[PDB]
Amino acid sequence: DMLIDIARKLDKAEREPLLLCATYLKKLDSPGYAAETYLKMGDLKSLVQLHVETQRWDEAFALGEKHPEFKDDIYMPYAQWLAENDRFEEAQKAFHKAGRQREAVQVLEQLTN
């Protein structure tokens, strides 16, 4: 709560305090606010890694629908997780939502074989 209030009182020019807040919020297992901070700073790659690492798949999917460039970063880990659960129909849909259409085809060809 205090790191949030500080990060909200800090200016957008204060990168070193803001990145120290975001890294402490990650270290303190507070990914929704580390996410708000990475979003305020515009570092979308660290944000999607944060949501995939903290396994917040719903927040990840919502970010990937807003920023199509991260569909691969979210659905590759999730589609691998579906394929490892033998949920290959759902995994094939997940690889497709990732933009990984060639792998969505190759997995189904491999299952057909």
Added chain:
Amino acid sequence: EQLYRKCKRHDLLNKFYQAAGRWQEALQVAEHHDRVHLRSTYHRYAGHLEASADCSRALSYYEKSDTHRFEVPRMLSEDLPSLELYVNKMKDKTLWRWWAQYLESQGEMDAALHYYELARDHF
């Protein structure tokens, strides 16, 4: 082996291990790096165990490949008592349906009904 490892081609390395008869290594590579072939590798290994006349271990690996529903009855079709023991041990619905169809063709309708009732196959 070193070349296939250097390529990161765990699929060709798994086929290689199978062809070399090194099934344990093949299963380890399938379990860690080639999870999509793992059912197929268990099925092929079960086929080689069946060919090697080790039916008990073949059963365990057909079960792991989830192909026991059609491969086990094929393999034990010559030894009916063992198949009956197996069907009674797994308590699987699909297997009780198959065993009831076998009893139905042999005319043992009272036993077929008993196993269709166990299988919940009201039809």
